[PDB]
A and B are shown apart, each in its own frame.
Chain A
Amino acid sequence: RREIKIEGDLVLGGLFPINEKGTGTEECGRINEDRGIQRLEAMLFAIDEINKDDYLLPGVKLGVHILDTCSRDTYALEQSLEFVRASLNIPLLIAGVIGGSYSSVSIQVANLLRLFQIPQISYASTSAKLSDKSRYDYFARTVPPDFYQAKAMAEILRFFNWTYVSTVASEGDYGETGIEAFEQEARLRNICIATAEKVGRSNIRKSYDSVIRELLQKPNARVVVLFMRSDDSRELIAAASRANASFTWVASDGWGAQESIIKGSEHVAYGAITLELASQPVRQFDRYFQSLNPYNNHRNPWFRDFWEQKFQCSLQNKRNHRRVCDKHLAIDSSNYEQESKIMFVVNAVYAMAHALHKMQRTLCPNTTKLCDAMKILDGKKLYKDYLLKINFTAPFNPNKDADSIVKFDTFGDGMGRYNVFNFQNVGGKYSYLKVGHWAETLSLDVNSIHWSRNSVPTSQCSDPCAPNEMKNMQPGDVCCWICIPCEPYEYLADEFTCMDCGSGQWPTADLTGCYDLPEDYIRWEDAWAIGPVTIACLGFMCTCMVVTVFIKHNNTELCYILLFGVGLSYCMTFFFIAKPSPVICALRRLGLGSSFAICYSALLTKTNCSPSSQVFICLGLILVQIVMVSVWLILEAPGTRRYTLAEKRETVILKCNVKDSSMLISLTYDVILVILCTVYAFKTRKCPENFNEAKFIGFTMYTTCIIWLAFLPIFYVTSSDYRVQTTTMCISVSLSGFVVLGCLFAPKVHI
């Protein structure tokens, strides 16, 4: 409990964790060799250089005032009253405070200092709570917060195309706040978490083993995002050693590049990506620090205590338990290492020096050897104006690459530069090697990855579907999508269910590929209807021969009328053509019905035995009825059948959908009436002709009646298609023509 103090025009405050936190009666016990002592001389070294150099505050001497905090909230808070007691041992005003290595310690000091308008810059505080300027108006950091660590790993997953990931955390401010930041960044970049959970401080292997087992049940995620401290980091690796599996670890600053994390379990941690803060070593500081001895370092009171603890020797009042310190003893590089945050401490000291120099230059134009009116200091002008807007190169830069520029953002947070460390096996010996950097955009070296590019783990949920054959549905989580197959005869849907085009459309690779591709009465007539047509053609040839001999004979008109009906029926089969037409279909139906009517009515005159005029008049009535349908709006253009239920690629329309429906009913009614009259008339007549003629006339009547009766069920069960519809019509008309010609030509041939 002492205080470094050096008189000067301006003095900078100091708060360092010189003594580690203790318990019992003593508030703080052993001295901190690295966090406290090493950072103590770094600020003293930096402040000494400022005075020596004439390019920064030439006529202004910067003082020093450092107070121990012992890593305790209550003790550090009560030690900050000295910096404010003189703003109302002679008290002296404090220009600013450069201290605070623990987030809890800095929070307590920031709350007290913000009320009294005293700017403060911390050198290691990475808490996200201090980023809320509403609660802490006057606070700045030379180190990035924990927000950027989540952002850096968020871009890592996007760069490696990792979407299905598992996140873990730890109890405390670090684990809880860090894991929340990752979720916000992942939402914008489209990364979904899996089995997210947190671990406690119970330090029980049973709980840790349960966490490891909880990763086993989810094998789609082989990458684990770590937001836990170094204390329990080794425990999880040790826990993961039992029942080992394959996992990829994406850790944070807690793991870092420290080799103490892995101890005999370097197989489960293989191929792990860890983030560590970038910190170049300071060459000048090493020479300065090694030249410190208790003989001349009277300013630092804690130096004597540090020497006793580090060397386990006593300088004054040495007892027999502890040997007296040997002479000519100095610290050397054999057992000395640089603290990871030395450059941050130096930058913090330079931040006020540059800010004070700028404020001195402006508020004291053409002045030196102290200032004018720089006795009372305004926090708002110095901090919010002349401290947040700072851009100067990092002092003592080993390479002067100019990439490291000390500046403060809108919230006062320092620039965020991180290092991506990859864990790999080289020469059979595991080691850490940096494989990239993260200033503002993630940069990675693919070639720098060794023995880990063989697999390139992905851990991706919902591998994209192919909309051509299966559609997409919404699962329980929006991020993942499931493949659902839809029926093949509907067009592609981008994200929704496949909408149905209708009937007769065949979708293709295009999204709107489905279109009307109707068939034109698919040519099954060559296989099916050709036979009846060839038979009909043979009948037509026989009819032509029958006509030729009848024409040659001159009374050796009734035969011509009967022959005309047979000839008209012959072309009925050829009337049906694959080419669609709204007039040919109507004409073919009317012609077929008319031909049957005249042929059937021809035998009516023979049974009754002037008569020619009546037959012609009766024939005209049948023709008038046939053309009566075409007069109305019954006729229409052919259209594809609505066979939505049937899985037919193409639709064929040949009957116009209005002709066969109406003509078949009309033709059947007309045929039935004439057939019934002829049958009754034949029986009533007492054979008013030759014996052969009477038998032939009677036999012909039964043949047409039997054929018409047999064809009646065929019409109902035709199921009009490209083949059955044409075959049924051709077969039925062929039988009627042959029967009429068979019973007429045969009696003439015999006689």
Chain B
Amino acid sequence: AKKVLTLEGDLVLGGLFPVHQKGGPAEDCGPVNEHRGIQRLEAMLFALDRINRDPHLLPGVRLGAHILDSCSKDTHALEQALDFVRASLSAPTAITGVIGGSYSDVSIQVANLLRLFQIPQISYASTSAKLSDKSRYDYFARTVPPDFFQAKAMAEILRFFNWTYVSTVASEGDYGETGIEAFELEARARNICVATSEKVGRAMSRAAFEGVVRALLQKPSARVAVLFTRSEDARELLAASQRLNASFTWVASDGWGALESVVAGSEGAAEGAITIELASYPISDFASYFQSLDPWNNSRNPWFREFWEQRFRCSFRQRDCAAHSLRAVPFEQESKIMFVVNAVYAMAHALHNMHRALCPNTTRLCDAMRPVNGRRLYKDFVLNVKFDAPFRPADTHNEVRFDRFGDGIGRYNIFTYLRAGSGRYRYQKVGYWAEGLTLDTSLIPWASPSAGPLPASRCSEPCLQNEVKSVQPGEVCCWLCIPCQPYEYRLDEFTCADCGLGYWPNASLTGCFALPQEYIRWGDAWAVGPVTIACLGALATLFVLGVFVRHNATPVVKASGRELCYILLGGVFLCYCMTFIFIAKPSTAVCTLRRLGLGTAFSVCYSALLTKTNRIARISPASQVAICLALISGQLLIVVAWLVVEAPGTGKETAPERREVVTLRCNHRDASMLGSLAYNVLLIALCTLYAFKTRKCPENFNEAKFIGFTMYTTCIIWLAFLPIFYVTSSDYRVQTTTMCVSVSLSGSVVLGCLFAPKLHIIL
């Protein structure tokens, strides 16, 4: 028989407390729910009694109660809630405000019914994402956080421990499917992605649980799992994990909470588990007022008799139902008891604010508010209550507020599963999540820095700052690191930047400033001998000219050409000087100038030879000197003009195992020297041809023999060295060494030939 708890008052508040259990199909309303129906109903009754008496909240207006039952059903809840609007559509009593159905389906149906009829609803216990949608339920409010705030808490706690690679376990139906999507979407911003988004059905086999545990075990680098399951589903999952000897840092939703029955029978495989539970505190006044009730005291509650008959096995015919003390009996307060009184006080505050803002003349309820409207109340007063929670502890601070979506503030208490030194296994509180995350890291022994914490990142990156090549789509959570090639540089963290193949990047991997080279690497092989020979050649010229000066005042020297001897001596000194200074730092006008002078010096020797054999072959002397001087000047002018026009100096090997060459402007001198070499070769060839037909008359102490020897020696040396110069041109180091030797060799041959006349002069 349907019954209603009714109280007479100016303003009446509805009720849909599920006192009766749903039961089986045969019994629509069988067993009486005491923890969730009777306790919360008595909490509402106590809140109404307290608000009635207190002269500070709606001081004059008295509040009534119209409490019904839902029987944990939706159609029955709708049928009972139809009585709420049976008087407000236009003895039945007008009902304003209801306190929800204490479920998801019941609250959804009640809100859908009351949205059209303009009746506000404040559900004391309802956590669903559908009710947060204002398009379908714009008149629904709740004092409990929705199911996506615990997702925020779990994502934040995962971020705090630097865990980014996680595996999610879902559940069939509501609270197991919606939570996964919200958690994933929220973890997208926090750079956290799923690994195995496995789901568990309602009737899911034990061997199937073992297979699912093996599926979780398939990923090796996944030591953390987030659980969205109901209590018994979590119990069976932990049992399967214990049977398969699988251990993870379990992270769980409100389903696990701090219930001992969930972990009971599976101890050992749940150590280090992290769980979050809704924050609540016991109320001493309600506990004293509930234990101050026996069946013969209260009449207002029609279901109190059924609760008494259910709780104690006595009977109201004649039995222990009158000797049962009920005092000092094992009793526990339901977690969601303070929410009921908070909702009642929020409704009382909204009504008081409405009365104050609409009836400011007298404390009595004015008649101007007779057409009660839920729209104005919900928009102005219900959604703008900011008051301290009644019966709150003095040390703590609690404020009841509603958001723009009608949901209450979120506060979750994080729990950890320990190993007591002397006690048994039990839970504890290590932190809370009201507005900002906070935990005591040192409190947890398992999740401590010293007891082998598990990052479970799966993408560990121990690579150096200059050895990162993380170029792979993979997953946005993390990526693998590879050292860059030595030829490249790590200028950019994402991709190695191969700014230059030659130079090796520095430690910072950003100094793409090239790699130089030196041409001053003196050694025993290429510097000890080559430098001495060039210096000796210049010194030998000084010794040679000394004999000539002493022999200048001699009849023998008069016959020989004084100008030719001086020109030959100057050319030998000039070529030797260029070779001696060739070992120097190149610049714009150092290396280029030195090589240009060497070509002129070599041509001077060829010109001196030409003017020394024409006279012998013929047999005006000034004509030969002028012609030779013009040829030397013409060759120098042609070379000098080419320097400005077609003598660009640049060269460096970068790709194949090499750095920038040690050169400034004498890099392309091979092309420039081709013209000078061709002129020198032609002059040498012409001199040799003339010398072949010369030396007919052996005059001047057989000086023609010396001239012929030079032609047969200088041409042979130049011809032999020609393939060497072309071959050595490939490598700069080889070319420099060969060039110095060739210049010194040419000067030595000329100096050696002139040694014989010096010996005759001395002797």
A residues contacting B by CB (< 8 A) are: 77-78, 81, 88, 108, 111-112, 115-116, 135, 608, 669, 672-673, 676-677, 680-681, 684
Contact = CB atoms under 8 A, between A and B. Distances in A.
Interface in B655-709: 678, 681-682, 685-686, 689-690, 693
A81 B685 CA distance: 128
B136 interface: yes
Nearest to B693: A608
B1 interface: no
B674 to A, nearest CB: 9
21 contacts: A77-B116, A78-B89, A88-B82, A108-B116, A111-B112, A112-B116, A115-B112, A116-B78, A608-B693, A669-B678, A672-B682, A673-B681, A673-B682, A673-B685, A676-B685, A680-B690, A681-B693, A684-B617, A684-B618, A684-B690, A684-B693
A677 B685 contact: yes
A108 B115 CA distance: 10
B421 to A, nearest CB: 56
Contact of B686 (A81, A111, A669, A680): A680
A112 B618 CA distance: 137
Contact of A81 (B89, B115, B689): B89
A78 B87 CA distance: 12
B686 to A, nearest CB: 6
Which secondary structure dominates chain A's binding surface? helix
A85 to B, nearest CB: 9
Interface in B83-126: 89, 109, 112-113, 115-116
A601 to B, nearest CB: 12
B116 A88 contact: no
Contacts of B689: 677, 680-681
B693 A115 contact: no
Contact of B109 (A108, A115, A135, A669): A115
Interface in B125-143: 136
Contact of A677 (B78, B109, B686): B686
Nearest to B689: A677
A422 to B, nearest CB: 41
B608 to A, nearest CB: 17
Contacts of A677: 685-686, 689
Nearest to B82: A88
B721 to A, nearest CB: 17
A608 B694 CA distance: 12
Nearest to B690: A680
A88 B79 contact: yes
Contacts of B618: 684
> Lowest 8 A-B CB distances belong to which pairs?
A677-B689, A676-B682, A676-B686, A673-B685, A78-B89, A77-B116, A111-B116, A112-B116
A677 B681 CA distance: 12
Given A672-B682, A673-B685, A680-B690, A115 B89 contact: no
Q: How large is the interface on B (under 10, 10 to 19, 20 to 34, 35 or more residues)?
A: 20 to 34
Contact of A135 (B79, B113, B136): B136
Contacts of B116: 77, 108, 111-112
A357 to B, nearest CB: 28
A704 B78 CA distance: 123
Interface in B60-94: 78-79, 82, 89
Contacts of B617: 684
Given A77-B116, A680-B686, A681-B693, 19 more contacts: A81-B89, A108-B116, A111-B112, A111-B115, A112-B116, A115-B78, A608-B693, A672-B682, A673-B681, A673-B682, A673-B685, A676-B682, A676-B685, A677-B689, A680-B689, A680-B690, A681-B689, A684-B690, A684-B693
Nearest to B135: A135
**Chief secondary structure at chain B's binding surface:** helix
A115 B110 CA distance: 10
A227 to B, nearest CB: 23
Contacts of B78: 115-116
Contacts of A111: 112, 115-116
Contacts of B89: 78, 81
A676 B113 CA distance: 120
A77 B90 CA distance: 12
Contacts of B112: 111, 115
A677 B78 CA distance: 126
Contact of B113 (A115, A608, A673): A115
A339 to B, nearest CB: 30
Contacts of A77: 116
A340 B113 CA distance: 35
Contacts of B681: 673
Nearest to A679: B686
A672 B685 CA distance: 11
Contacts of A108: 116
Contacts of B109: 115
A102 to B, nearest CB: 16
A15 to B, nearest CB: 15
B477 to A, nearest CB: 33
Contacts of A115: 78, 109, 112-113
Contacts of B690: 680, 684
Interface in B632-657: none
B288 to A, nearest CB: 41
A112 B116 CA distance: 8
Nearest to B109: A115
Nearest to B83: A88
A91 to B, nearest CB: 13
B734 to A, nearest CB: 22
Interface in B609-647: 617-618
A209 to B, nearest CB: 37
A684 B82 CA distance: 140
A672 B680 CA distance: 12
Contacts of A676: 682, 685-686
Contacts of B682: 672-673, 676
A112 B678 CA distance: 110
A115 B105 CA distance: 12
Interface string B563-601: 000000000000000000000000000000000000000
A594 B529 CA distance: 45
A116 B89 CA distance: 17
Nearest to A674: B685
B367 to A, nearest CB: 19
Contacts of A672: 678, 682
B75 to A, nearest CB: 9
A347 B79 CA distance: 33
Nearest to A84: B82
Contacts of A88: 79, 82
A111 B116 CA distance: 8
B130 to A, nearest CB: 11
Nearest to A87: B79
B4 to A, nearest CB: 15
A81 B89 CA distance: 9
A25 to B, nearest CB: 15
A608 B82 CA distance: 140
A680 B678 CA distance: 17
A234 B62 CA distance: 59
Contacts of A684: 617-618, 690, 693
A480 B252 CA distance: 53
A116 B109 CA distance: 11
A88 B136 CA distance: 25
B128 to A, nearest CB: 16
Give the interface centre of B79, B82, B89, B136 by most chain A CB atoms within 10 Å. B82
Interface in B271-327: none
Nearest to B681: A673
A680 B682 CA distance: 12
A81 B117 CA distance: 11
B607 to A, nearest CB: 14
A709 B159 CA distance: 86
A685 to B, nearest CB: 9
A108 B112 CA distance: 12
A468 B220 CA distance: 58
A676 B686 CA distance: 7
